[PDB]
Design a protein around this ligand. Structure first.
Ligand SMILES: [Zn+2]
Ligand SMILES: [Zn+2]
Ligand SMILES: [Zn+2]
Ligand SMILES: [Zn+2]
Ligand SMILES: [Zn+2]
Ligand SMILES: [Zn+2]
Ligand SMILES: [Zn+2]
Length: 212
């Protein structure tokens, strides 16, 4: 149900905001984990609603959350670049919707782009060398190209989602975040993505398919 699914997604957003607020005793990496989990949820909710004023408000909320976290963790010098990336992502999501890209493709693209931003911020915060950062950026650019060429159905999207989550979990662990903490947040991303993937079996063309 579109309304039940929405209610669950705003519940997940509220819970993520509550955890992000409990930031005093969190490390910068844990804060970055909370923030990109929230922004992933916000962008998944915007994809689900497909509504102009919702796009505007959730983009505002994502930009606000990113700026607040960057200030807290002493990465204020990144604010403009990060805001640009977030805006670029939201613009691209809207573009792929307007051009008729499959919802599977849009959801995988969104998850991949949020992770790319997340891992970049985590590596910058940990002081990784520019060559290692580039290594990870290029490997995931290649992976994105393949995944978007590969994902044609909901089953394929669910399998690719699992693969993505497994590998990024390994990378977040290597950066020093508690494996179990990573798992809690990546599980929340998986559940939201499955919820949005659920809608579209019931959008108007999907209904025409089922009912003929
Ligand atoms: Zn949390
Ligand atoms: Zn649609
Ligand atoms: Zn509206
Ligand atoms: Zn405003
Ligand atoms: Zn960019
Ligand atoms: Zn066009
Ligand atoms: Zn390992």
């Amino acid at each position: 149900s579109k309304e039940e699914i929405l209610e669950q997604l705003e519940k997940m957003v509220e819970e993520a905001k509550e955890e992000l607020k409990k930031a005093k005793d969190k490390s910068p990496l844990e804060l970055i984990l909370e923030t990109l989990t929230l922004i992933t949820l916000l962008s998944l909710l915007a994809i689900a609603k497909e509504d102009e004023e919702t796009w505007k408000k959730l983009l505002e909320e994502a930009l606000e959350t990113a700026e607040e976290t960057l200030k807290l963790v002493g990465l204020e010098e990144l604010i403009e670049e990060v805001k640009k990336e977030i805006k670029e992502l939201f613009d691209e999501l809207k573009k792929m919707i307007k051009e008729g890209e499959s919802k599977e493709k849009i959801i995988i693209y969104n998850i991949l782009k949020n992770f790319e931003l997340e891992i970049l911020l985590a590596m910058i915060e940990k002081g990784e060398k520019e060559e290692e950062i580039e290594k990870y950026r290029k490997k995931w650019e290649e992976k994105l190209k393949k995944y978007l060429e590969e994902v044609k159905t909901k089953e394929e999207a669910l399998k690719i989602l699992e693969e993505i989550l497994k590998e990024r979990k390994e990378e977040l662990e290597k950066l020093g975040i508690s494996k179990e903490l990573v798992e809690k947040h990546l599980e929340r991303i998986k559940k939201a993505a499955e919820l949005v993937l659920s809608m579209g079996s019931l959008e108007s063309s999907g209904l025409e398919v089922l009912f003929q």
